[PDB]
Amino acid sequence: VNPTVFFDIAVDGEPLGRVSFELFADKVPKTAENFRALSTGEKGFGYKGSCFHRIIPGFMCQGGNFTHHNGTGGKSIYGEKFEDENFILKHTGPGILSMANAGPNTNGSQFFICTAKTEWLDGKHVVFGKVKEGMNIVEAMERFGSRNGKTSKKITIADCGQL
């Protein structure tokens, strides 16, 4: 059974509301599990307090970075990086949850929430979940972005976990 997770989103420290995601563990269990564990924080680190640092209206919201010892960009629960598990799932429309990377097999913690169909990224980014409720929150976040990705207010994950 696919796990559900939630982010409680804030804008300049003010809670806006909740977004929940279905994680497609039935298709990419390793990638889903990394995201789940970083959402609950059960390994001692994860998305809580993290921020959406690059938001491009019409495209997507990217976050999941946090500082760690011995490098940069985030770490996964399996190490500094892990393999592209598979590319079964495509970027089919708004709400899609998919992994940011720095090329092949460099998955960590960073991810993005699509606000459009992003077909050009199929085969290069592992899709692994989808917004379940609170797309209105993601649409509200999206307005705080810009063409170059800079946000006009600070968008954070005030809290997160599993439902």
Binding site: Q62, N65, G73, A100, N101, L121
Partner: peptide, 11 residues
């Protein structure tokens, strides 16, 4: 362009 990378962000 429209990419989602982690470090060397391209156009």
């Amino acid at each position: 362009x429209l990419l989602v990378t982690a470090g060397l962000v391209l156009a």
